């Protein structure tokens, strides 16, 4: 930023963006593991079928 009091707007801009970027990475992991809670179930019959 090269200036004072505009990095304060920047560092609080990355502070809220990381929060919205970590709240999706915690939500996609337990959704992908909710896929493999159901889709990894019954794979052996699907190989046989």
């Amino acid at each position: 930023p090269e200036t004072p009091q505009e990095r304060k707007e920047m560092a609080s801009g990355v502070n809220t963006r990381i929060d919205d970027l970590q709240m999706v990475l915690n939500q996609t992991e337990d959704h992908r593991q909710r896929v493999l809670q159901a889709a990894a179930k019954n794979i052996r019959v699907w190989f046989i079928k």
Partner: protein, 41 residues
């Protein structure tokens, strides 16, 4: 039934291998706004 499972874990995993990089580039941006502020002061 299978194209749902095929396209989900193909879209999510390539999202995860891209959104981790977008996240790991941003935390080293959040620290170098924090480190140079106290260094300037």
């Amino acid at each position: 039934n299978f194209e749902k499972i095929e396209n989900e874990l193909k879209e999510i995993n390539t999202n995860q291998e891209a959104l981790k990089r977008n996240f790991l580039e941003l935390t080293e941006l959040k620290f170098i706004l924090r480190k140079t502020q106290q260094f300037f002061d």
